[PDB]
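Note to self: the last two entries modelled the partners one at a time, which told us nothing about the interface. This time every component goes in together.
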Amino acid sequence: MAKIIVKKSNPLKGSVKIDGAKNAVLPIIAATLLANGKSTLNGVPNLRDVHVISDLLRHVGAEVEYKENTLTVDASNIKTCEAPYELVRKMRASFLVMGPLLARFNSTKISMPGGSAIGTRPIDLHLKGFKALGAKIEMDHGFVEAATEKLVGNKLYLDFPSVGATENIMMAASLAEGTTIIENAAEEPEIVDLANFLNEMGADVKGAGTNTIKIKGVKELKGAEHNVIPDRIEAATYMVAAAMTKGDITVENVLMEHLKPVVAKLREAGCEITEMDNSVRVVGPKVLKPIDIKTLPHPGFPTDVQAQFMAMLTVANGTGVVIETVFENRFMHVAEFNRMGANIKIDGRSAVVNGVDELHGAAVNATDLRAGAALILCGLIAEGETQIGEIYHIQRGYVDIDKKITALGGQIEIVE
Amino acid sequence: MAKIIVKKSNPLKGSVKIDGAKNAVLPIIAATLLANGKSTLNGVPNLRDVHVISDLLRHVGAEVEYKENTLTVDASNIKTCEAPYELVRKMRASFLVMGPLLARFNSTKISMPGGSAIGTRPIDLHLKGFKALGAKIEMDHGFVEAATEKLVGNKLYLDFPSVGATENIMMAASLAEGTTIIENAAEEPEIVDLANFLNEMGADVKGAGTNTIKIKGVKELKGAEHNVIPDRIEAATYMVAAAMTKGDITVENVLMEHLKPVVAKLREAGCEITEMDNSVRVVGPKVLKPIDIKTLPHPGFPTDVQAQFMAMLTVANGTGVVIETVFENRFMHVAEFNRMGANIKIDGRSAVVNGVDELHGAAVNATDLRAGAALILCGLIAEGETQIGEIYHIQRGYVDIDKKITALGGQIEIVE
Amino acid sequence: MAKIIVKKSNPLKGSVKIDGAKNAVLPIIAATLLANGKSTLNGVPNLRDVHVISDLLRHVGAEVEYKENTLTVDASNIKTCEAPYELVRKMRASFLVMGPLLARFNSTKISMPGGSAIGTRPIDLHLKGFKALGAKIEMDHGFVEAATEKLVGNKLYLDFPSVGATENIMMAASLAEGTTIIENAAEEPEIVDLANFLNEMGADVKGAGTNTIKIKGVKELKGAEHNVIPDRIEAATYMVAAAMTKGDITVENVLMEHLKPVVAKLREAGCEITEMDNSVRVVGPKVLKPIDIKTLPHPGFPTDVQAQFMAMLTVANGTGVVIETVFENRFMHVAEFNRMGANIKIDGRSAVVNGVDELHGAAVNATDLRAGAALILCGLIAEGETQIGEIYHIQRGYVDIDKKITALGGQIEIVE
Amino acid sequence: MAKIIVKKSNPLKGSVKIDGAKNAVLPIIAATLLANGKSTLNGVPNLRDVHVISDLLRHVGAEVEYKENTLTVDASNIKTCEAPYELVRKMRASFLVMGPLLARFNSTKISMPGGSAIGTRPIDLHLKGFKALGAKIEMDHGFVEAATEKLVGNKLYLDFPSVGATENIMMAASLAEGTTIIENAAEEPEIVDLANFLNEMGADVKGAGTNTIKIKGVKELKGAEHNVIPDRIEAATYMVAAAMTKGDITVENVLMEHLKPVVAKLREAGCEITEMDNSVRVVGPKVLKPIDIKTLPHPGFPTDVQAQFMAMLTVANGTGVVIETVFENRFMHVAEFNRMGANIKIDGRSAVVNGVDELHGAAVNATDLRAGAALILCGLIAEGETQIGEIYHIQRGYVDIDKKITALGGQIEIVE
Ligand SMILES: C=C(O[C@H]1[C@H](O)[C@@H](CO)O[C@H](OP(=O)(O)OP(=O)(O)OC[C@H]2O[C@@H](n3ccc(=O)[nH]c3=O)[C@H](O)[C@@H]2O)[C@@H]1NC(C)=O)C(=O)O
Ligand SMILES: C=C(O[C@H]1[C@H](O)[C@@H](CO)O[C@H](OP(=O)(O)OP(=O)(O)OC[C@H]2O[C@@H](n3ccc(=O)[nH]c3=O)[C@H](O)[C@@H]2O)[C@@H]1NC(C)=O)C(=O)O
Ligand SMILES: C=C(O[C@H]1[C@H](O)[C@@H](CO)O[C@H](OP(=O)(O)OP(=O)(O)OC[C@H]2O[C@@H](n3ccc(=O)[nH]c3=O)[C@H](O)[C@@H]2O)[C@@H]1NC(C)=O)C(=O)O
Ligand SMILES: C=C(O[C@H]1[C@H](O)[C@@H](CO)O[C@H](OP(=O)(O)OP(=O)(O)OC[C@H]2O[C@@H](n3ccc(=O)[nH]c3=O)[C@H](O)[C@@H]2O)[C@@H]1NC(C)=O)C(=O)O
Ligand code: NA
Ligand code: NA
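The predicted structure of the combined assembly is written out below.
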């Protein structure tokens, strides 16, 4: 089956346009279900996970049309409030329809996400929020059912500033009676994009991007046009590629505000970075300085760039430490980096990376979306040729990574 | 040497006035050193750590006067910029004079804090910030020296949202040339109090209490009058005491905004809590419901109430899990709780508490400030009599815990 | 693709014959490569991993014949000393030919194992041992090459009592010049079986099953007949099944010595166990008592029975804690147990299991060999019907689990 | 109060005689209580912990005489079976009288050890063993009481190969009716010494030093003469000192068998070591090679030499990783090493040591016995002068460390 073949490449040089954020668009597509009427989402990346959640909206009865980076949804006449096992198994962000459906129909039944490549990932905080709003929860043969006679706003506290739980609870609260306060909310940029979209539909959401979000429920929402924010993780991926290849890359169609920790850590590693209004230029250092990273809730260093920064550290001039506080098992890529000649040792949530002279091409498997992209970065600097398998992991969340890297001068090819 | 003797007590009932926040006043006292002139701090708790940092200010040449909860400082004619080993060894918040002194005199030499009861606690992020402002750092025989020809504002990123580093860097940046941005800042309420005080002295600090703080340096600051915020951890301590003793306590002179996670978790445990403008009433449940807590940066659950909530969980109706993400070794109290008949097992950063019928009085030692207070809470509900040793831990950060608990109907006595 | 369908079942009752140990036979098959001549292995389980390593022996030029639980190997005329990427990727115990090949031909090149379902699993200790014997090591594009002018016995210390490293080093040392001492050796029963087989071929291996193994190299080894020990993990799997289903099962063709920790922990959980010469009877309790387990090197509790004991604990009468010290990510099954209604929370290497009334059938995926078998145990007691996917994990290491459970009265079927 | 002053020293050269093992003698002194009659222990180190447990034996009514490294005990006419809070608080090995007293009198009451400098250290496995022998356990106000109508031999499984629990259970089982089997026993050399002493008194203990110990109870034991084994941790401490100071030291009166992992790791670090019958010569390398250590049950690397090897690694030529699997909080020394200019970062149970050019003298505090000795090793190589406080930690478990290091050419002094 399919492989990505990467060869030792030239320093990457030129411009790359960044697509719309996967992780903004998935909850915003779920949010269209809140509205009686038609929404228009612009800047939608052409990704498999977008098509899967589109098919979930079709399954519950919304009218969905995608073309040329615009997705329309008419949720006027939703029929059903069940998310079947196969769709949640394919893509766990499916779970984000639970909030909207519960809010629109007072009842929903959603397959409970199972194992994940990057860890045991419970959805307890989502359900905590729904119960605080007056939903009763029960489990039936792998499904979780939530039903109420009406949602009522309430104060609720998130034990962890969960991105997903913040999204699900915000959407449910938008149509509740009264005022909801989400304490210890996720501050991620995608949370702000979602809130903006809810407000464009007629909601009253304040505080998004802060530690506390206040939602005053409205009786009804209407379809609206929204421009999705740019993919900050894709941007970061190309910024790291510039660092690792000692290249010079302008990343176009980005928001600097959303890239703060990545910019800071790349500068600490030796990069020369120029921040502009809609773009950032990254020039890689001649010698990579070892740095440490610790993944944390935004605006701490993002776990979605952890594997990619680890890959950069494998040829840094010294010892770097990576600490993963957000996910349990997000080190499955380490053994693959080691096949390419890295010197990485893990214990618990920390990985000690001892920089080597260079990596050497080898047959490797992507273990997950961000680690696969990290193996592509390894393959750009590794001597010889790298063959990456299980490439569906990559293809589900990066638009045309082969074409974008090809246009920056790298040697990469998807073969079937 | 001295002991606190606690006996099985009546349910606590009545009102308790909360003192000024230890952890607000210590950085605000350090901040008085920034000003050429005299500051007046009202609501200063009469605590040993206040007197230690006062003596540190005396050592560098400030004029300090304390009386009846007001502290005045005239920092007009500071002489010296060295913090000696004995003062930092006695109280590690001593380290918070480094920022002000560096800013006022362009040079400072500060003993580097050593071991701590609750963990290995580096000060690397403080120094990261100072270097970003143009300070050169070097180590000399246990001291860290930082010197510059002038501080210049800069963007800097905190790998962890460190309370202390946020404080130290904010104070240094207040007199720097140009604009400093602290990304991934601590959002703790004490950070806001400090910023307010800097602004009262003439500074330009915006964003405090958010994830990003922007400081535009000014050439000079002037002494100002400030009212310190109330001690949110002391308040929480009494709120827990109400829960554990099945009492009914009004905590006076508090800010509900600062107590959000404690209020939420006590309500989840079964308490009936009434939030008012300057006070909160806590009525304890008849049966404590087991809850889980996870310590996190504000507004996540505070590590300073972790031991005290653990103590509550030792008689809860089931199994609770405590996860300490902020400090490394903040479980030294567990063996002492176990001497009183708790059923607690730890591995790594998690403690599994299996609720028991009741605790039984025993001879125990406080291991640190918040754990000692937790042993007092255990002793209020434990059968018989509890004798607590190493009480200096407690006395350094609680005002008259014997008198306040005595006025709420508990049986407690300090003996010499 | 294929599924195992398990339904709520009767208590299991009757006898089950245990097959030969997967984990004894794989290193013993690698060890046949040491001998110039023909070996005969009896009690070989008819498992996919046996056929994969057989094909690896074919690839290097040994003559291999399997029939009716006997495998013969003639290693007289080995041709090549390379283990290709596809065979090691399929089955990482492939790596165990490195020791024999290095010893027979003074040179070997072996693909370095990559990611594993249950953790990042380096092979550094294997290479440490080979270097101590005089091998030079280098990496070439995912392969590790080891070559010497002659192996010479030496003292070497294992940082961890690695099963695989102990096996690989013992086999290499059997043909070395002089005496090797392996300090901090694995004491697992499979290590003793291997040593016995080496001695049957003419080796001089003493201390196997103790913390120190002394090998005096011989110039040549000869094929021998060996009876492989019974599969202690398969036995344990059926013993757990008896406990969980409240059944009464005699496990036939086992060695009690190898089952000590499993027998002790099942008795602590409430089982009535009768140890006999070649068999053990397990009668399950009416109420399962919660127990804690901590995985450790033999004779500590085996990590290969961890998932299966976790599954038992999901319906125990209280709270049990599972601590995995041997493998990093061996909790991927937890999310699947949770889909079936378990109440499991993990942090770091510990899992807190809060016993529930009963499990409920659901669609689940095996994540690995021992966890898949654990999902079958869940499905026997879960209400309704459980559908298990990714069943190749199970089928690679259990002989006819459907037929054996069917003969004990359970309802299970493999469908294609 | 008292300090140890160490100055940058010459390479250590000469011979040092090692004393009797603290950790052998403490359980062997407890074991004298088993015998009706008089025991004579030779090679008893003149240590405070020896005098504390001697006073515990006096408290229960044994006749104890110490002189010139011989301790006699007549346990003929024991009166009482209670270990008071003050003696256990002073020295937690006090707990090891519980087994003997329970066995001699069928009843005992022992204060339950509280907090410890190096971790939360439960005694649950001790009690598990006693209950398996027919003892009923209950807690009374910090004491644990264990009583039976008679101890009866039984099989019991240790979840962890606890040194203390193995000792306590072995001593209790020596006078039980029938045969006890301890599965997953501690294999530490001190366990063998104890068993030898029990057998010298008339017991029947086999398997000590293996993973399984079988005790056939006898009705009565008689006082015997015993020669205690040498202190393997003291020996290791001086061996490390040779490595760190680039010296050349013969350690006299040792058993090489007990030092295997320390010898292996020092050789991996670059030392030239010569093993002899009663002694070992260690010559330190010119450049220390970084190594990793992982603490484990014997014969894995001992946790009691972890701090001392960490100290060696602070000036090694590269990055070493220390992993502590045995104790929870055994990193309290790290902040003190950092005051002396080390570069150590911890997360969870792992410490990353990044070797520096040299350490620099500073005021430091011992946190515990083995860490204090490690600070002395730091002070021998640190530039200038090191002042170590809280020296009682050191003095309780090292005989005349000042005099022994002075005789090897180091500059050290205890001042009062
Ligand atoms: C890996 C992905 O990207 C992830 C990204 O890594 C994380 C962190 O920034 O935030 C999103 O996941 P998420 O919403 O599942 O993440 P969070 O809920 O913040 O999870 C972080 C931590 O919270 C825990 N968590 C989350 C929810 C909950 O109810 N309980 C809970 O314990 C998780 O198990 C984890 O330990 C992204 N996904 C989307 C669709 O936005 C992906 O799903 O493809
Ligand atoms: C225990 C105390 O209270 C503490 C309270 O527990 C914590 C957390 O809320 O915030 C203050 O400490 P702090 O400023 O030292 O805490 P933080 O800097 O946030 O430390 C949290 C975490 O960050 C780490 N940290 C901090 C600074 C740094 O340069 N590097 C670093 O790794 C710490 O080791 C720890 O793992 C309080 N002290 C004062 C005077 O405000 C006490 O010092 O008495
Ligand atoms: C899961 C399997 O069964 C496993 C079983 O779980 C373990 C533990 O009992 O022992 C065998 O693996 P193994 O030989 O790879 O296991 P070990 O080497 O003991 O690994 C235990 C620990 O040591 C570590 N380890 C091992 C070798 C090494 O060079 N370095 C290292 O750090 C591992 O990563 C792990 O953390 C079994 N496999 C066979 C074929 O005997 C399987 O491979 O199917
Ligand atoms: C630090 C000391 O030396 C120690 C030495 O570090 C350790 C490890 O080698 O073995 C002796 O302690 P010990 O008998 O208390 O140690 P162990 O019982 O093996 O403890 C190791 C691990 O097992 C745990 N443990 C032990 C007993 C128990 O019932 N439950 C339990 O969980 C401990 O908490 C720890 O995590 C030494 N003490 C003596 C008097 O022999 C000291 O007490 O001064
Ligand atoms: Na844990
Ligand atoms: Na770690």
